[PDB]
Structures are given as structure tokens and as C-alpha cells.
Design a protein around this ligand. Structure first.
Ligand SMILES: Cc1nc2nc(C3CC3)nn2c(O)c1NS(=O)(=O)c1ccc(C2CCCCC2)cc1
Ligand SMILES: CCCCCCC
Lengths: 49, 49
């Protein structure tokens, strides 16, 4: 009689996540970052204009 | 010293086999011959969540 009940299963490598340094800039594409940076300053100069 | 139920029917030659929710036990295996366990059924505790 069985002394241990079990079954077949799959073992795989658990991917350890890697944290890139640009992770927080990742949500916005670099062109969006450049555009928002330019927008901040054009609005800033036009306020005082 | 008298077996009732399905085990009683099997041991007293009133039946050839006992198909059902029959748990393999030490005493029952001493009295009757069991097939291989086709589903794992231990004893477990159910509680209200
Ligand atoms: C391809 C790659 N592989 C990496 N492996 C690592 C790890 C764990 C050690 N980081 N990392 C990366 O960051 C990249 N990408 S990068 O070279 O284009 C890049 C570099 C630096 C910055 C800034 C982020 C703000 C602080 C100042 C530096 C941004 C982007
Ligand atoms: C959330 C604001 C980010 C400004 C980035 C300017 C390059």
C-alpha cells in the first residue's frame, strides 16, 4: 500500500526580477519626457511674457 | 466481533466486492482484501470560515 501519495508536476526556474535604473522614467517614452520638459519651460516663459 | 455494513457483507460471503466510499484500514485489511486505493481520502477537519 502506498506510503506517500503524490503526482507528477513541473518544476521551473522562478525568474528573479531585475530592477533597471530607468524604471521610473520607463512609463513615459523618452520623447514624451523631452516634450513635457520643453512644455514646462515654454509655459513658464509665456506666463511672464 | 461481528462485522456489519459493506465489510460485513464481504467477509460473510454475501458479496464478491464492496464498491463504494470504503476507506482502507488496518483492521479492514486484516479482515478483507483491498484493491489499490483509487482516490486519496484521509481524515480532515472542516470548519466554518
Ligand atoms: C541596459 C541597463 N542595464 C542596467 N543594469 C542595471 C543594474 C542593476 C545594476 N541598471 N541598468 C540600466 O539602467 C540599464 N539602462 S541604461 O544603461 O540606458 C541607464 C543607465 C542609467 C540611468 C540613470 C537612472 C537614474 C540614476 C542615474 C542613471 C538610466 C538608464
Ligand atoms: C512628474 C514630472 C517629471 C518632470 C520631468 C522633466 C524632465
Amino acid at each position: 500500500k502506498p506510503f506517500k501519495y503524490q503526482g507528477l508536476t513541473i518544476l521551473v526556474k522562478k525568474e528573479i526580477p531585475r530592477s533597471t535604473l530607468d524604471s521610473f522614467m520607463q512609463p513615459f517614452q523618452s520623447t514624451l519626457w523631452l516634450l513635457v520638459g520643453l512644455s514646462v519651460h515654454v509655459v513658464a516663459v509665456m506666463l511672464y511674457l | 466481533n461481528v462485522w456489519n455494513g459493506m465489510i460485513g457483507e464481504v467477509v460473510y460471503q454475501r458479496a464478491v466486492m464492496a464498491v463504494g466510499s470504503l476507506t482502507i484500514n488496518e483492521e479492514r485489511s486484516e479482515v478483507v482484501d483491498f484493491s489499490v486505493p483509487f482516490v486519496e481520502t484521509g481524515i480532515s477537519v472542516m470548519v466554518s470560515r
